[model samples]
Target chain A: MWQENKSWNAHFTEHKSQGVVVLWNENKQQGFTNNLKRANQAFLPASTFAIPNSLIALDLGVVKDEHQVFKWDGQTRDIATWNRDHNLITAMKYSVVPVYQEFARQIGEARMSKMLHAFDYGNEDISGNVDSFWLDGGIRISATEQISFLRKLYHNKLHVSERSQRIVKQAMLTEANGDYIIRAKTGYSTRIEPKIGWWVGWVELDDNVWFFAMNMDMPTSDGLGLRQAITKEVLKQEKIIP
Target chain B: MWQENKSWNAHFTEHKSQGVVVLWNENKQQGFTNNLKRANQAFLPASTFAIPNSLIALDLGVVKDEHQVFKWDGQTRDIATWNRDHNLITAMKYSVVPVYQEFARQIGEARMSKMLHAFDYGNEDISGNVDSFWLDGGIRISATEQISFLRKLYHNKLHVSERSQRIVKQAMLTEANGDYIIRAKTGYSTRIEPKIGWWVGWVELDDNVWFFAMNMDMPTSDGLGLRQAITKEVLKQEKIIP
Candidate 1:
């Protein structure tokens, strides 16, 4: 159950970005949403699907291990970091497109669709190219749905092997400082009519684990920072990250 | 001035570690210290000196730039990651010993000593082997002193050139998630009578840039995480990191 907290609107207003922020406290089973309507509005999952894609890849043994190096085929990409060989850790750290696409390609269409349905992922729709479905295709996930998936992943409740879930979670870790551990994924859809950027993840503290998902209007790459900035402001106000 | 916050002792108690945490709010000109006496107890800076060392190296052109690769001379090392070539960013990320020792050697004795004195760092002693002084030599600094140095560096107030300070700060970035930016370094001295582990750095947010310095009595390598764990708990209680 969620309690709408419109107070978070100021953060979005300050950044002049239209977005919705939702945080769910796992232990308490309590939730906070900036705008409940938008929280339920599904949008493209984009790279945020990396979280599930990693789990599926790991489960099927499509990738040998986290350290399995994916060699670059010498195809030039816009992101400079993607031009080199990368293992899962580095691949996840940089969110390399070609590497993860390679994972999807190896996972194959039939297996990828089967696992998405099995995992109860957003829309469960792999209607487009297996490699590009989550990026610019029919796949979409609401903020509320994002939290549900993460909560289950945090507790290893997914049907996948525990080893697969455990390794993918470590790969998603954004930061581990003090007693707090944050694991998250950032996604952006530049090809969309109004560019959208997403920051989704959860934070683990001594008190509780809070899951959050946020997407904002980010037309230019320069505004990408606001996706996390606005989400963090709301989290701070709610005493989550600190 | 620092206000004593004895409440933070519970974190150390929970971690079963003996340590001191000192945090100073740059904007507020306020400070929080747990065990001021212990916070003042000097110990080896260990790898924490990498912050200043990088600054000095850049200032002297000992290293050309962050992108300049430091080749591993086929010397077998304890940490597998150190066996490969690394630019400044990777070196700082791994806190590579051989790389920084190479930096110290290139900086040379006279220039290194003169620079340390100019920066008012620790005991101003590169007394033993210049390359090994920070690791096991007489150079020592307290938790409170660490924050002082970091606060100065954060504001680019250090005597070194602004470019040197700016580049080193970027090199020290531990994490940048949401609206918060953390720049820190971890240090450990195994040769000391009682092993010492240090985590020192600053946190930047919209509210304030908080400087913190922490060192713990760690008997073995396993307890290294406690150094930052304790510091972060205190920072959280003060509404810093979230």
Candidate 2:
């Protein structure tokens, strides 16, 4: 396991401020864990993997009205236009909030709550309003659970249909550099002080797959991008890619 | 000297990736120095202290055409309007480039070069055309030189008139927290690769003054804020503030 390697252990311990979690899979089995204690503690996932979950819910026919319109922050837009323009893919790519809010609305409060429990996501509350449950508060997930969820989704082990899973996989794709294909989602919650950041993803090599999750206290806007920067550095240290 | 303290030395060595310089003075005398080697190396100051220099040029009566109009990025505006909208104080506060460009054009090339030499700023070239010399490549200053320049400016030792110094000081003022008044300038040069980030300023206490210059290879925007964050953390460690 990569986490068992001295270099990986050193890097993980040195950057404890990042509250990092690195988990890899070889043939669909968990291979390594680091900072697992903090990774298991409940905290907001922000928007990291929310869009894919939303897409899964949509594909389940939970979202009967993707065109539903709602007003927020004094602006209004239909879900279809927001989804078409914003979409699950764009949401994951850019961390757009309004589109996700609309998705939450279309999925309805009850279904969204059920989806969390089904995934065994952190806490599995979602009792708060749909628009803010995964963001502002209420819903939480550890970095460990985050990678676990991604592991399942990546291997098509989710209860969602294969078609839905494929759609999500396509949407979450971030980069294809040389021999590695990276699909990741970045999350940042600034609704409160000492903001939290997330970069969770999987890297697919020629013959193996690795899943990882990273979260950190951003404190200020300056820290927002560290989520991805730290993760990539670790991956590079592991020689997961050139 | 603050650098002699265990915490400060430890912090500096740990974050050596940042080319940092922290110098303090009590009544115009040197108090301390850290990372003096790189701090003395010539490098672009970016937009960090450009405003104070612009104010110096303006006070020379060389900027006889603060009202001159110019076109850039496909927009046209007179310097007075730009300055009025983006005055020296606002320019320093926000690092507004276009306003400084107008200041550069008004001050013209020769005087800008002369002013830098007189200030003994990095290399004192200003040969790469007006407006962008400080930010681009032609002009540079080390962290040590930056603090030296600030030290002189703080002591009213520069050749510029008292009025010019006062105006620049007012523009540089950033925070007034309790007994500490922090006047600073932040610079980020994103136009090139291996981007540079800077936070240069002094904290004025009731009995003493401490000046700092922090520069780091940003690589990504996420690291930009560390310049100030790390500086402040050091100050706190020294009990410079609550």
Candidate 3:
């Protein structure tokens, strides 16, 4: 049967310790084992960490000046000094850490923690340091939960206002072709041994939408390609994208 | 028309100076413009350069000893002393240049050039340095001609005996899954300004076969992924492989 011939299995077999989860319409799911317990921890420079920051920026109506300066680690820098103004779009596109760290400081831990719980993100723990929690300190989510969260966010089911959702969606746009648009975020967590790399997003077509979350044990940077490679292969096998 | 949505176009647009051509059963062909006239040159380390050498080894019944040694660029090394024994399969798999260079010396220039004409390879000119002609000094083949040659080789239409064809085929096997088998060769030519990279092969299913040849101008090593990336996307779009 074609179902038995899962194209993604070949990748999973080669990287035995990895996990993947895909959720489509009405709870249709496919995955390798251990989808639930694995920590959804984000690495040192997780790109998706910018999502919540973008949302918080919009929700709080926090306007950042291009010349606004902040000090971190030991150095002081302004937005314009860091990769051309470090706007939310640039922050998300390049996974700039200091930009999100500043966002966390402005949003404050209480509101951020509440927002995390509202979205059912990871363990909803932001008790640790502001910027580092989602990066390496605490916040953990499973591959399965990541897709579920994305599914809701894709359909406007999250509690945030439509404007906030729109801002985040705009930041997530990676590619668009004809009736197909891909909104994705890549996360790499280096805090753990056997590093974890993530590629998560939803594909919106003219007629349907499919959400996928892929993470793997990446011992080296070369394994970074596996996350997107396996997800794209599965999407093709499922005929979600041509 | 789905045919009009060939995903390879997106890649070609991003890589404006590159070319790709894919041909399958009947009058089916897909590509970017000028697929016929683009320079089909490859450099010293080209992997497919080993294919003809493998064929010569099998046809001439020339047995290479594991202990056989060769000197290249002032260094002399044996099979084990190098990266293991330089057999037909090893030469093809690793693209070991010295092994094929030795094969050229044994097969001699007259016979090698005649074989190139027989196979209608490239410009059919090995008139330069006997061993390095296909690499840089001479030989050229467009993407269209590559698929044409591959189509013949895939169907046992080559003039070589079935045994020799089988030996070459065995060396080309890259992956086998379910009812599908993929045989491919990747060529990277670094002699040019923007390196030329190629992914050429066919996919075999229980009921049908599809041949593809993808080449692109790579600005940096990162661009190398496009060759296989675009090819696999096209194969999936054509429903040639799941």
Candidate 4:
């Protein structure tokens, strides 16, 4: 009979606290996914791995009372001279931050307008002039974060549509080996926008190998198809490190 | 300009749920820490990496109210529906189960007493006594368990007395076929009663590597000597597997 010692769960928690370095190459780049596609880049290692919730040691000030260490382990010793390590490990709480990057020019209006023109050519029966282009955008990453972002956008999809049935299209791109690749794309014309967004991705997998790339798009005149082809080719050429 | 989609995270999740089996023969395991020590066993396929925390649809009946389909883009879907279907998959969570075995046998109290005496001599100082013993003893295997049981047991060496003070002895027997045969032993002794327990077993690793035999005495005893020569010869034996 073998006796197991220190719990594996406990060790995982301790190691997590040491703050592991996120390897840029091996961590996320190997397989591109929806969040990467949507953002057109790899999320930071901490975000991708959901390490925000894990805690770290914090530095707190010294205690004025010398009597702190003498507390009983049931039956204990006297209050002697104590030497203390100033930094105490504390539990870390996580808070989500909104992500945004400044572009050299306003790409949203131009991208939407071009997509609308393409939609007009595909569906000649509809002769409605474009209203204010309502574009919903946000960052996407892990499964949980993607769901959260989609939920918010689906609500906005309903709030934005007024006259003509909304045309929704979605696209995502992920960086893989320095190439920006289009992972997936979905487009739809809807009388009423559904409560969900679009999921687009591409997977290159063989008998012994598997590769993935994906992203999300909201179905609207300004959806993902606007970005699909370019994203796919870019991901093909680039090396995306986590 | 690359327009990235959003569903990237969900896409990866779906790919993994479809099953990304990492083959044992494919992965090459190597030792860490000390190079001379064989901390890891090398295998053939290198490594099959998969997305972590990918969700799968479960029968709600088994999970109760918990939904098996995970939400991607604010919509829930089953894992089977999302198949990247590339390789055989092995999940760390679902693949391993703990197996516990028990052995009991009846012997003359005098013989039991002698065995207990040798056990005492083996362990004089540490946890020193056998509180009690029952005549009925036998061995049974409980469930599928991990083979690295000894490593788990050895992890306690830092804080606990038996771990910090005692030295663990192990013997590796290499079969004629390049397989491994291994036996490991450790002991504990108590001052109150001079008693000891011995454990014996065999470890079979790969086609040519395995180990067998029994371990007697306790390092938890007052003083114990580590015998490496006896262990080394016992471990190097003929092929045990067909």
Candidate 5:
């Protein structure tokens, strides 16, 4: 069971019409078919992008509580009501699968495969490319295992966990947006030992967006872990799309 | 010129005794010689141990402005009065040779010998031991060359100077009392790159009874640099000799 402190949830009550859908899809080839007439070829279209091996895709939904008008009859009682009644607002809806291959490559292969496998989605190819990976409706791992692995990769040691916690605590307090998603990882590079980890996440506030990922193998937490406000201006700098 | 923040000086008025001495010493091969023949082969007696090459030795001095007695007795009171009478003290002058050496087994003997010729010291034994070579009273090297060489070693572009500094730092901090000196280093093993630099220094606090090398690596005016107090305590526990 996911604890409240470490769980993921979303709700849209008054903003129901403003909700979005994420769909995941993939194509696969089977060497043998059940009938054995020919090798099976499957092209599965996912209902929601929350599935195994689905690319990160999103569908923006409709907009509600909008008004449209065009008129000039003589006198108006209040300019506010006139503008509210005369202005037209259209709904916005679209689907997008952000290009993440570059991002994945930046993260490297082995641990990328591990994270993808945690969701039972991706496979590593001999060519070093991973495919057929996506997030499920939710991600769940034993808190002890996840924390231990994360601390192993992030904290300098078990004793240094206090320092790591201090870093995360400061980042959460001073750098987080309305809703914060912070990640930290550590590991070695160019060694048989897995020595690389990073904090990657995004934050959304109204029309504003903020996304960041920082490689951390040292004492300090990444700056992305500290962002407190996802200002539209800030998103302009990040240019991260989902 | 050193800045005010980077340097310090203190003078106190008090009645103090002072002494000076000169002597002739023996040499090897000839056993005893009057002329400068055995000068190169001479060694300083314990009373004159402060003389080396041709320079006066400096001490870190002592402090006695505080009362730290947690125990009491006949001998303790005697020690307490002694502390009060001549509370602050200085070290029995001990000489030090700022040492430096280079070893390159990777290269042919001729090339290694050529490199050693730059310094007045040269040897063929590439074994990883202190090459016992002595510099003259004032072996000359340009300040620029000295600074350049030091920076190279500090940055670890040259391994010889790095190793030398490590050994010296370790020796200065390690306890040699009774051979239980075991082993200890001056500073915390934790390090930062592009470090401004910091260091700890020794002071024989209670006459020749107790000594402490407070770190100067920042976070202190002494310029020793960032370090944990716990690490400093651990070093004191094992390395500081009475």
Candidate 6:
């Protein structure tokens, strides 16, 4: 669902980064991407897997609802924000690793593997420890595949029941305004050499719907903001945002 | 340079009208139109003729400059607003037809036809009467031709001196802001069958430039706004405007 859009190249170059972005206008059935070759090359999902992970928890009822809270573990984590009690909304906002790690353990090996195959996500690889496969393991996905999965999720066209897709959509929301709504997830894979940064999302307007996925090289945490910044500038270039 | 884009149909449908739009991205060298056949079929230029008329006026120096004022003609006119004086800016803002009709008389047939030959505008027919050809004579232009002429005018590639194109661009501006600028002209031809409405212009941003020309069936004066409305909506769908 992606075709080369050379016009968008400057936005990536302006940020002093090299990346790919795949965007689809749902109603128009039109697709545009900046770097077609790179957009198809697979990279570890990193925290972006949380989107589908949230869906798995909801579908299995392992996560009751957005309001269901996870108790703060007495054991402190590297990210201070993740050390506190959180719900699906806050956990996704902070991208708490331990909470979703627990979700994989509860879903367990066979169920998790089956679910990954069901979602047809990444390489469907859950070979390493279930808790870290999306991080350091071989499970990987491309920007193209990310937007494909997202198109279904947003339309409630995924295999899961509407309830699960709807609940997960609610959890992914980053902002809502009278005129527009943006639902998204951000991920960074520090375990991989040269690392990788990801920002994937869908935007809804009264007469238009656009799903976009972007990932870029992240050699250091210093350029972390580049992920969303590049995605946003592209959106503005398309007039998807003011 | 126009290609059909079915995605823009909904924008026109929602506006309760039927129209054709031709758009070109200056840097990408891309072109899009809603009704390809109609885009190539010429219609009465209506007031849109003012664009070239102004260009012609400036190039011939018939009109001294942007601030050069036209004294109020003592003869009363049908439009109450035209009972007063105007410079290029005010005359264009209100589309005072008589001022432009006056421009045609000064340009005369031989020289006007020669310039039309040079610009290659709209079949180059000035038959019925030099002053009223664009309104009631054989002179006509398609949306495709409109943008073609505009592309050259914006780039100062129209054979005319850059000073002429520059002055006409100033006369065409409808709005300007720090972030974006719109330069346009509107036309309503009450003299033709079922009448015709026209809107033509270009939008400029730091990284993007879009030149668009649109005309619609104007059954009644009530739909005068439809010309600009349909164009703006298509721009929104394309994310060219907010």
Clashing pairs in 2: none
Q: For model 4, report DockQ.
A: 0.01
CAPRI tier of model 5: incorrect
Say what the RMSD of model 2 is. 19.6
Model 4 chain A: lowest-lDDT 10 consecutive positions: A52-61
Clashes of 6: 0
Docking class of 4: incorrect
Residue A80's lDDT in candidate 2: 39
By the TM-score metric, which is better: model 3 or model 4?
3
What shift in Å separates residue B150 of candidate 6 from its native position after superposition? Answer: 55
TM-scores of the candidates are 0.54, 0.44, 0.44, 0.17, 0.20, 0.50
Best by the TM-score measure:
1
Stretches off by above 4 angstroms in model 3 are: A1-7, A14-17, A26-45, A63-83, B1-242
Query: Which residue runs does candidate 5 get wrong by more than 4 Å?
Result: A1-111, A114-142, A150-242, B1-156, B160-242
lDDT of 5 by residue, B213-238 (tens): 12221222233322224223333433
Q: Put down candidate 2 lDDT per residue, A192-239, tens digits, no spaces.
A: 654788888898764478888777777776756567667777788768
What's the distance in Å from true for residue A10, model 2?
A: 58
Tell me the tens digit of each residue's lDDT in model 1 across B106-140. Answer: 99999999988888887788878889998878888
Mind giving the per-residue lDDT tens digits that candidate 3 earns over A156-206?
A: 678876557655875676655333567888888876454778877877653
Over 4 Å off in model 4, which ranges? A1-242, B1-185, B188-199, B208-211, B215-229, B237-242
Model 1 chain A lDDT-worst window of ten: A173-182
lDDT assessment of candidate 5: 0.22
Candidate 3: lDDT over CA atoms? 0.63
Write candidate 4's Cα lDDT for B48-140 as tens digits.
Answer: 000000100011111111112222233333433232211111111111101000100122234334532332211111111111222112111
TM-score of chain B of each: 0.96, 0.82, 0.79, 0.20, 0.21, 0.96
Per candidate, the number of residue pairs that clash is: 1, 0, 2, 106, 30, 0
Tell me the whole-model lDDT of each prediction, alpha carbons only: 0.82, 0.66, 0.63, 0.21, 0.22, 0.83
TM-score of 6: 0.50
